[PDB]
Amino acid sequence: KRVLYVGGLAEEVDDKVLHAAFIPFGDITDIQIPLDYETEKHRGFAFVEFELAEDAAAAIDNMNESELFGRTIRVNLAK
Amino acid sequence: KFVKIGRPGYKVTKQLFQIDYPEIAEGIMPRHRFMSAYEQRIEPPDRRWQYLLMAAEPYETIAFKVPFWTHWNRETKQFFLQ
Amino acid sequence: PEVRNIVDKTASFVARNGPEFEARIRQNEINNPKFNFLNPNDPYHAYYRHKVSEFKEGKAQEPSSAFDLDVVKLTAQFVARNGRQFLTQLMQKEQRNYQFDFLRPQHSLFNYFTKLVEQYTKILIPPKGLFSKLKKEAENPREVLDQVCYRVEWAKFQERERKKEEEEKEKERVAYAQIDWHDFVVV
C-alpha cells in the first residue's frame, strides 16, 4: 500500500502526469493509466506506486476529488 | 412521487467543490456521487464522460463532468466538499 | 396608483381573511365598483386575486506477553513523570543506546501505551492516590447507587443517540438512493 489508485485520468494524462501529480509526496517508482487498447485514451483508472507509504497516503488523502484538464480525478486506496 | 422539481440552479465553483444554496429546513444533507453518462432521455453518442453530482432538496444540484469528505453549513447555507 | 392600491388592499384583506370575506364584502358593496376588483367587474380581478396569494404566502410587500506488558508498565511510569512536552525520562530512553519499541505512535501499541498513561494519570490525580483518599467509595454504597444510576442514565441517552443516528443515516441513504438520476448537467 505505497501507491495512489487514481480513477479519472483526463485525456492529456500520462504516466508522467500521474507521477508528477503524486511525486511531491513521494518518489513514484511505477506508474501507468489503464487504457482500453481500442482507443489509446486513458479511461480513468491509474496506478502511481511510489516508495513511501506516508507520501502515497497523504497524497491519496489530500488530492481526493480534484480537477485536472477540467476533469475530476480521484486518488484513493490502491488494493 | 412528492419530488417537486422547482428548477433552482447550482451556483458552485470547482477548484474542492463549493456551492451556495437555500435552506430547505430539513435534516437531509446533500448526497453526492460520480457515475457514468449512460442514463438520460436522449443519450447522445460519445458517452464515456461521467456525471459527478451532489444533489439535495432545496437547490438545483451541483453536477458536472468527472472523467465523509464534505459537509453543508446549515446556519450559513453553504456547501463544501473537499 | 388607485387600481393598484385597490388590488393590493383587497390582497391584504384576502391574505388575512380570504375569499369568504370576498363573497361577503361583494354582497355588501356590489352596488358600486369599489368592490369590482373583488368581483368579476373590474380589471383588477386577476391582479387582485393573485396579489392576495402573494401577500399571504410571502411574495408581496405591504402596499405603499508479560515481558511486553512490563515494558508498557515502564512506559506508563515514564509518562507519569514526564513533566515537559520536550523533557522527560523517556527522551533519553529513545536514543540512549537501547531498544525503544513502544516509543512509536504509528505502532498499535501506542494506543495501549496511551491507555496505560490514562491509568497512570488516574493514579496521579491527587484525588486518585497521591495524598488524599475519599471514603465515599470505601464505605459508600449510596454514592455507589448514585453512580450506578448515573451510568444507567448515560446508557439511556446513548441508546437514544444510537437509534437517532441509525435512523438519520438510513433516511440519508434512502435519499441518495432516490436522488436526481436523470437530469445530470453542469453550469
Description:
- The structure is cut from a larger assembly and holds chains A (79 residues), B (82 residues) and C (187 residues).
- Chain A is built from 2 helices and 5 strands, in the order βαββαββ.
- Chain A is of the alpha+beta class.
- Chain A starts with a strand and ends with a strand.
- Chain B contains no helices and 7 strands.
- Chain B starts with 10 loop residues before the first strand and ends with a strand.
- Helix content of chain B is 0%, strand content 37%.
- Chain B has strands spanning 11-14, 17-20, 31-35, 51-55, 62-65, 70-73, 78-81.
- Chain B has 82 residues and is an all-beta fold.
- In chain B, β4 and β5 form a beta hairpin.
- Chain C is an all-alpha fold.
- Chain C has 7 helices and no strands.
- Chain C has helices at 2-16, 19-29, 45-57, 66-81, 91-94, 109-124, 142-177.
- The longest helix of chain C has 36 residues, at 142-177.
- Chains in contact: A-B, B-C.
- The A-B interface holds A 8-11, 43-44, 64-67, 70-72, 74 and B 14-17, 34, 48-50, 52, 64-67, 69, 81-82.
- Chain B: This is Splicing factor 3A subunit 2.
- Chain B: It comes from Homo sapiens.
- Chain B: The modification Phosphoserine is found at residue 36.
- Chain B: Belongs to the SF3A2 family.
- Chain B: It is found in: Nucleus.
Please provide a brief summary of the model:
By secondary structure, chain A is of the alpha+beta class. Helix content of chain A is 23%, strand content 30%.
What characteristics describe this protein?
part of a larger assembly; 3 chains; A: alpha+beta; Alpha-Beta Plaits; 5-stranded antiparallel sheet; 2 helices; globular; C: 187 residues; mainly alpha; 7 helices; elongated; Peptidyl-prolyl cis-trans isomerase E (chain A); Splicing factor 3A subunit 2 (chain B); Splicing factor 3A subunit 1 (chain C)
- Largest β sheet strand count, sense and barrel closure of chain B: 4 strands, antiparallel
Structural classification of chain A: alpha+beta
**H and E order of chain A:** EHEEHEE
Q: How many separate structural domains of chain A?
A: 1
Percent of residues in helices of chain A: 10-25%
Classify the beta-strand content of chain A into a percent band: 25-35%
The CATH homologous superfamily of chain A: RRM (RNA recognition motif) domain
How far the N terminus sits from the C terminus of chain A, by CA atoms, comes to 7 Å
Radius of gyration of chain B from the CA trace? Answer: 14 Å
* Lateral arrangement of strands in the main beta sheet of chain B: 1-2-7-6
Radius of gyration of chain A: 11 Å
Strand numbers in spatial order across the main sheet of chain A: 2-3-1-5-4
The tally of strands of chain A reads: 5
Count of individual helical segments of chain B:
0
Biggest β-sheet of chain A: count, sense, barrel? 5 strands, antiparallel
Strand runs of chain B, count = 7
Subcellular location (chain C): Nucleus; Nucleus speckle
SURP motif repeats (chain C): 6-48, 71-113
Protein name (chain C): Splicing factor 3A subunit 1
Site (Critical for binding to SF3A3) (chain C): 74
